[PDB]
Write a protein that binds this DNA or RNA. Structure first.
Lengths: 210, 144, 85, 149, 95, 98, 127
RNA sequence: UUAUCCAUUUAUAGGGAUGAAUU
RNA sequence: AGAGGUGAAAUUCUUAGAUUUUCUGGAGACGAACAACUGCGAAAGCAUUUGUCUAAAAUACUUCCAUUAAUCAAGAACGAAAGUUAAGGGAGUGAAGACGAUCAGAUACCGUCGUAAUCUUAACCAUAAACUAUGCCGACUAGGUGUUGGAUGAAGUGCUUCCUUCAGUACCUUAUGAGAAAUCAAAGUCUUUGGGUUCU
RNA sequence: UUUUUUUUU
């Protein structure tokens, strides 16, 4: 209505724009606080608009408003998702699909679950219409990829996890090590979700956001 | 208000301090189906199928009352019913009111053993009138 | 040999009561008294002790349970959900 | 195949050379002096030939010595009373029943138990027809576990 | 009269195939018998695609497609003016 | 395969190496160190279990807690009773050590 | 000062919902539907109602202040249907024609890994 | 919450991070 | 201030805020897209992940037994769905039923709701267009295109392709083969009539 | 969206 006021939104310092838009906040009257109504809400942004490049248009980031100072909402990473339209664009007949998922533990005691798509590579000399994979190598590669993902996520924090998600650095070494077992086409991480986040530590967010 | 929603509880305390008031019959349980955002209030579903709002400080046992399914086996004979009610009350045997004399029961009397008047009595009926189906909203077989 | 072809334990009831009623307690007689398995000893020898009280033949330690079973399908599920947390 | 479908011609084709090959300078004496040695260690005759031909490199024991392998385990009283095939079938049946004892919903598995029980019964009948298997021997399923000996 | 050699389905070395539901009528059809079309569409026809292009931003935004993979029952497929009844002799050739 | 390692290794050491079964056998072997490897039952009370595991790291013997009540090593090995505690005297050509 | 909102278009072979909210999804700004305009109990999904239900929200958005908007397209649900109704084309057309700034586009029709069986039995719809 | 009403007890410890244990 | 719904309509929900947006939980259900004239199983049937138990098949063997084989009345195991019994569960669908429209009538097709059922367990029931309508074992008779799991030789870069060959597995053409024909590489090798066997 | 019917040789 005529009373609702705009609140600018902010992104963590790692992203180069640090600002994508403004939200709307209703009447700040009575006992209802117009600070927790703004707080604990989800903003769904696209990496393409958030980094001013068209390369990162196939995935999107969810930012949860963790805390508010003055008026600018600072938000924080809470979930990652790729666009299902790009997922189904990637999906095609003749190539077997592989899924992976696990629960990881960061040094910040952050509970993260990530799901990963995996395709197979036609290469050059196959001379066949199909690129199916015998289920034993699917077994093996799913186990090995889950193991390596857990290993890489156990000894790192959440913020550097985002630092490595941005250049899709997770989708390269897996292809590198699968080249010696079974060639895989373009793969990636589909969705990452926060299961249980520790108590909100205000001291650990200022030096990251600023 | 400490346990998550969806858990099964027994020996409910419908008001903080009654040291056990609700959900106490054998095989009965309630399910916590919601917690208020600000705490201090939760919703539970009782074995009767009704939702009740109780403060979060109320206590309860987590689990299901023992000796479950007691009503499953059929009481074979009058003897088991006699022994059952002998340690409970004087509610047995019943004796139909239509088999009594008209002095002792509004159903009684007549040459054909019939009620004669509608058996759905009002909620405002006095002590000697509240004898049939008390303030019945409907009658007959249910359809779900 | 085999005296009762189908009636089994309900032979103590003779011809009294309904056939379907005796057969409905035939769903429960084979398990109210049956030797089920205890979880503190390991012999399939538990016996009915009361309406809710239960006991095997080794432990001499009673357990609250179902009316005529050591565990009830509701109570195993309820325990499983609690354990999962 | 006795049960199911599929021909499955995979097998071992013995060579035409009835005698020992020219390179087989290893004498039949010490060739015979290598089978009971591995036998009383505890080893099935179906694998004794395999280990002889893999490590000692002495295939066709019948060709190298004018006697069969079970003949040269049987001439000296070291052969088991229950034949190898029957023993390997009753161990399979014992595992079958140990599994089905706790897992009673495994209906395909108990169908396979029926199949192997029929196999055991007919093979035991055949071995009974020969004098090497006692006529009193019955293969009661209850004592199948102890029948391994 | 054994109209088709395959009997109208592509089932071989199988006893049962889990079925699916037709999109337009909901009729339960076996998966190998249903007429399946992986439909690729434009959410906007090119005439208005030019409009959204000129009213959009980034100066290079490209239209993402729609991926349906619809299924039809046989009874409704021929009424949907897609499946040809065609001829007996040329019935055999598929592609 | 994971539990097959324990099951098959035990079954094979029974036949190859010398073996014994019983809580009395275990106490007799583990009051001298003869019992090479010692197993404690999950079902058995912790009072039973923790003294038997106590014996192991005085004896420098490997103790493992078998999840179960009465099975396999008490049913499949040679016996039909509730074993509730296991120990091995001697080892043959078995990799049970690791 | 450029500002971004998100508009959800819902096409289900009936009234085309237009639901314009901020970029959080929360705190809706204007909801217009398709049946808000035609009183004939018809053309709810038709471009007739669909595109005239969009220049009005364009004007409302103009007087509110927000200019740049993303779009999320919805085709019924996970059981009812999968293709957007006739109203989506006209909804896009009117937003394009109004001069309203259009940003990124996405389809968020709920796709079930589940297979909860739909209306009608095995025989299916007979009409 | 002070009128008023209800519940509990021996009116028995201010808010946040199958063994015992009294002088 | 509408929303569901329909060829229309109506029943129904909706100022106590329906539909719609987002987040959080709970419940039961299913396991799409991958997913195929592809795999496994005696058939019925069997698709999220991982673990355990158990089996089966093919391949390779210069491992072993040596006829231990095939088909089988009786007799047995399993046997879709629906249904019965009894508990638990009950989201969605939904025989019965309740309404609302069409119709001359509509007890039906269409719409809304809706009990049993569908789901789990423990027992029964033993039937399906349980269908490739084609019983099982064995020998032989033709080319090509595929494809699944091995095995062999060679060659694009330890990796990966082509040749050959087994066990499946379908498809196209051909029959001086068959059939009444449709069609069949078996439904052929049958008046040039007899490989063995069970059922009808 | 609806469309029932047509003695006997």
């Amino acid at each position: 209505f005529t009373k609702k006021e705009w609140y600018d939104l902010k992104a963590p310092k790692m992203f180069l724009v640090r600002n994508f838009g403004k939200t709307l906040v209703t009447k700040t009257i009575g006992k209802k606080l117009a600070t927790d109504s703004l707080k604990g809400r989800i903003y769904e942004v696209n990496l393409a608009d958030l980094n001013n490049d068209e390369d990162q248009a196939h995935k999107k980031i969810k930012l949860s408003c963790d805390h508010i100072i003055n008026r600018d909402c600072y938000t924080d990473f809470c979930g990652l998702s790729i666009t299902r339209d790009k997922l189904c664009s990637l999906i095609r007949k003749g190539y077997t699909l592989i899924e992976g998922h696990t629960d990881v533990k960061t040094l910040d005691n952050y509970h993260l679950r990530m799901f990963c798509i995996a395709f197979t590579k036609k290469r050059q000399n196959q001379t066949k219409s199909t690129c199916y994979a015998q289920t034993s190598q699917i077994k093996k590669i799913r186990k090995k990829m889950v193991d390596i993902m857990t290993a890489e996520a156990s000894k790192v924090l959440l913020k550097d996890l985002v630092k490595k998600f941005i250049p899709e650095s997770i989708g390269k070494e897996i292809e590198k090590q699968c080249k010696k077992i079974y060639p895989l086409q373009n793969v990636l991480i589909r969705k990452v979700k926060i299961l249980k986040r520790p108590k909100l530590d205000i001291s650990k967010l200022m030096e990251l956001h600023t | 208000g400490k346990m998550p929603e969806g858990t099964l509880i027994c020996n409910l305390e419908h008001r903080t301090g009654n040291r056990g008031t609700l959900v106490k019959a054998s095989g009965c349980y309630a399910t916590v189906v919601g917690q208020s955002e600000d705490g201090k209030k939760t919703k539970v579903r009782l074995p009767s199928g009704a939702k009740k709002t109780i403060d979060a400080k109320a206590r309860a046992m987590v689990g299901v009352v023992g000796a479950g399914g007691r009503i499953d086996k059929p009481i074979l004979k009058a003897g088991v019913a006699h022994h059952k009610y002998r340690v409970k009350r004087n509610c047995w045997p019943k004796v139909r009111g239509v088999a009594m004399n008209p002095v002792e029961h509004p159903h009684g009397g007549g040459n054909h053993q019939h009620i004669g008047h509608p058996s759905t009595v009002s909620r405002s009926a006095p002590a000697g009138q509240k004898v049939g189906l008390i303030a019945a909203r409907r009658t007959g077989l249910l359809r779900g | 040999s085999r005296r009762t072809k189908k009636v089994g334990l309900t032979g103590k009831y003779g011809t009294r009561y309904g056939s379907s009623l005796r057969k409905q307690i035939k769903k429960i007689e084979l398990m109210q008294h049956a030797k089920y398995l205890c979880t503190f000893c390991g012999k399939t020898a538990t016996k009915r002790t009361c309406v809710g009280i239960w006991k095997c033949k080794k432990c001499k330690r009673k357990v609250c349970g179902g009316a005529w079973s050591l565990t009830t399908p509701a109570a195993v599920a309820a325990k499983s959900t609690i354990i999962r947390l | 195949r006795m049960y199911g479908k599929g021909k499955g011609i995979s097998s071992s084709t013995l060579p035409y050379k009835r005698k020992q090959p020219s390179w087989l300078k290893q004498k039949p004496s010490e060739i015979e002096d290598a089978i009971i040695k591995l036998a009383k260690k505890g080893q099935t005759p179906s694998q004794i030939g395999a280990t002889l031909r893999d490590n000692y490199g002495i295939p066709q024991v019948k060709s190298v010595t004018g006697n069969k392998i079970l003949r040269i385990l049987r001439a000296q009283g070291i052969a088991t009373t229950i034949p190898e095939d029957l023993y390997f079938l009753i161990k399979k049946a014992v595992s079958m029943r140990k599994h089905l004892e706790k897992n009673k919903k495994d209906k395909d598995c108990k169908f396979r138990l029926i199949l192997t029980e029929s196999k055991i019964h007919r093979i035991s009948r055949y071995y009974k027809r020969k004098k090497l298997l006692p006529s009193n021997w019955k293969y009661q399923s209850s004592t199948a576990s102890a029948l391994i000996a | 009269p054994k109209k088709r050699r395959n009997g109208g389905r592509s089932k071989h070395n199988r006893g049962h195939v889990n079925p699916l539901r037709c999109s337009n009528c909901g009729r339960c059809v076996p998966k190998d018998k249903a007429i399946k079309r992986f439909n690729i569409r434009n959410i906007v026809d090119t005439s208005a695609q030019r409009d959204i292009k000129e009213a959009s931003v980034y100066s290079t935004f490209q239209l993402p497609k729609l991926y349906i993979k619809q299924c039809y029952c046989v009874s409704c497929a021929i009424h949907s003016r897609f499946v040809r009844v065609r001829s007996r002799e040329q019935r055999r050739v598929r592609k | 395969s994971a539990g097959d390692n324990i099951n098959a290794k035990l079954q094979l050491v029974m036949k190859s190496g010398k073996y014994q079964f019983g809580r009395k056998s275990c106490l007799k072997a583990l009051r001298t160190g003869k019992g090479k490897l010692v197993i404690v039952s999950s079902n058995c009370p912790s009072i039973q279990r923790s003294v038997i595991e106590y014996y192991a790291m005085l004896s420098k013997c490997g103790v493992h807690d078998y999840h179960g009540d009465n099975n396999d090593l008490g049913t499949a090995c040679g016996k039909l009773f509730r074993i509730s505690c296991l120990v091995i005297t001697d080892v043959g050509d078995s990799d049970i050590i690791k | 000062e450029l500002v971004f909102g998100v508009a959800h278009i819902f096409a289900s072979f009936n009234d085309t919902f237009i639901h314009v909210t901020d970029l959080s999804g929360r705190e809706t700004l204007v909801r217009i539907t398709g049946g808000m305009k035609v009183k004939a109990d018809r053309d709810e999904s038709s471009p007739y109602a669909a595109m005239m239900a969009a220049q009005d929200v364009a004007a409302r958005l103009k007087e509110l202040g927000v200019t740049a908007i993303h779009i999320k397209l919805r085709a019924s649900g996970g059981t009812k249907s999968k293709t957007p109704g006739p109203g989506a084309q006209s909804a896009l057309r009117a937003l394009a024609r109004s001069g309203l700034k259009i940003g990124r586009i996405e389809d968020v029709t709920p796709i079930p890994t589940d297979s909860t069986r739909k209306k009608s039995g095995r025989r299916g719809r007979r009409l």
